[PDB]
Each structure stands twice: as structure tokens, then as C-alpha cells.
Amino acid sequence: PRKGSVPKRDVLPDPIHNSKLVTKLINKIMLDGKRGTAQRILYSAFDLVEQRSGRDALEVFEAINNIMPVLEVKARRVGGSNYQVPVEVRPERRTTLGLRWLVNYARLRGEKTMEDRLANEILDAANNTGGAVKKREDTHKMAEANKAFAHYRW
Amino acid sequence: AKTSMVAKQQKKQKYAVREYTRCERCGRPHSVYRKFKLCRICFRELAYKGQIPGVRKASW
């Protein structure tokens, strides 16, 4: 509940999910200011996502319940020595960290076309077996499972 | 890069065999003449309309 945050001033209206995350993921995986083209590249395999799966793509895009940096170990050298201490993520930071988490930590396993494998890796991703979903348990193993110091906050 | 080629023509440093003597102020280094600092192209333009007694026809 930090009142003081970074000046964001961003917009992301989506008429396919009725929220501000579908366009947030369309602006996170966007390149060379691609907004309208992003939707075309996102709807290019959108039908295949719901065609190569047995669940609803909208709610599948249950695969988003295992890609959040719960408590990542950041850099504060505490007590005059070079040590690492973990920190808590913000609601308006973990959503942007996990949104592009599969667009950088899930580029080692692909097949078929160029946008059909994205949903292929999207399916059966909740169950720890991939690389981008392996960072979720790696985040908690980098701060909680191995006890460390926590007083150095940021 | 004609200005950079008309500048570095007789640069004398550790090796004086690196600078190539060509048209003093004009261009067309090839298809001319170079021995007494006077290229045909430049001399022709420098003798345009009969200037310094140099550009002639024949007359033995």
C-alpha cells in the first residue's frame, strides 16, 4: 500500500476482455509502437488458442495463476557487506512482470507456426514444467525457502 | 569526399610515399597528365577561352 509510486500515465482499453490488462499485454509485447497491428498479431492465432485447447482462451490466457514474482530477491548490500535481500512486488508491477514473463522465459520451446506454439506453451503451463513458470517457484526459492535478511527493504 | 581528397594530396609525415600527387584544385586524377603540377582537365578549364599561353591546337 505504498502511496508514493512512479508516474505511470498509461492507457489500455480492451473491448475483448472488458478490463485494462488485455491491452496492457498488447502494449507490453508491443514493438515499434504497435497497437492496432498488435491486436491483428494477437487475433492471428487467438482463434487457434481456443481451437487447440479444451478450456476458454479468455480465462486460459488458469495458466496466469503460476507466473507472478511473489517475492523476488533484489539488491541492497546490508551492513557494509555485499549481500542480497528479497522484496515484495506491487499489484501494478507483478501483472506487467508476469505478462511478458512468457514472452522472454518461454522462447526455448516452439513448434508449428509462430503464434500457435505460444498457446501450446500457454496450455499445461500452470503445472510446473516450463521455463517461464519455473521462475515462479525460483522466485520463492530465491527469498523464502533459503532464509536471509529482510530489514534492508527496497 | 572530394574536399577531403583535394585536401590530403601532398601530406608529408613519417612516410612521404603515401600522399598521391593529383589535380591541385580540380579533379579527374586519371585520363590527364601529372608531372609539373598541371592536369589536362584543370589546365583546359584554366586555359578556357585562351588564358595563359598553354592550350593550343597543333601548328607543328
Binding site: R9, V11, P13, D32, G33, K34, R35, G36, T37 | -
Partner: protein, 127 residues
């Protein structure tokens, strides 16, 4: 000279780095026809441009700052309009018929405390 252009439209100032000659207008560095949320008149979004007669004679390659959903649109047109004023003095005299300097005499009023929109109020609620 057509860079650092001042153009405010309903609280939406935006600088434009237009270059003389090349005409590669790429707002947001890509498509500008499928970016604007609404903007029905996408081709009629530049009214002064027609009189300016420099549609394909300047490359925008700039951005937009602040504004609303459609309030951020039709702001770079005035941004390059002021940039053309410094780029050529003929433009000023060429656009004497229109001459767009200010087009934001009011703001946007919605839900507010005390008064409905701090001006109007409920009157005979229809049953």
C-alpha cells in the same frame, strides 16, 4: 526547421520533429490510422494540412502527450502547423483564412461533489 512544434488541443500538447523533404508520417513510429480509438474523420483529421498543401512534404515521426481517448488525436496536426510557421513564413499568410491558434475554450465536466457537474443539477426526474 520544423522540430519542437507547440500544438495544444483540449489539454493535449505534443512536439513534432518534422523533417523537410521526406514524407514518412509514422505517429507512435507505426500506423496512425488503426491507433486512434475513435476519430471517425481519420482522413479529415488534418483540416489545415489541406490549405498547407504539404501532406507528403514532411515526416512527423513524433509522439502525443496527455489528452483523452480521442482528445490526444488531432493535436500533432497543430504541432506540425506551428513547426511549419518557423519552417516558412509563407505558411502563416497561406493559412490566413483558417488560422487555428486555440481550439480548447472549455474542458471536460463529469461527476463532481455538491453540484452534479458544478453547473447543472437534477430537475423533475422522469418516472
Amino acid at each position: 526547421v520544423e522540430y519542437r512544434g507547440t500544438g495544444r488541443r483540449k489539454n493535449s500538447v505534443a512536439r513534432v520533429r518534422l523533417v523537410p523533404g521526406e514524407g514518412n508520417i509514422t505517429v507512435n513510429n507505426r500506423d496512425v490510422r488503426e491507433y486512434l480509438p475513435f476519430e471517425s474523420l481519420i482522413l479529415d483529421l488534418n483540416q489545415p494540412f489541406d490549405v498547407t498543401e504539404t501532406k507528403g512534404n514532411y515526416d512527423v515521426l513524433v509522439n502525443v502527450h496527455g489528452g483523452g481517448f480521442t482528445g490526444q488525436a488531432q493535436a500533432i496536426r497543430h504541432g506540425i502547423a506551428r513547426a511549419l510557421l518557423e519552417a516558412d513564413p509563407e505558411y502563416r499568410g497561406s493559412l490566413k483564412r483558417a488560422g487555428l491558434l486555440t481550439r480548447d475554450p472549455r474542458m471536460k465536466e463529469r461527476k463532481k461533489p455538491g453540484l452534479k457537474a458544478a453547473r447543472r443539477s437534477p430537475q423533475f426526474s422522469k418516472r
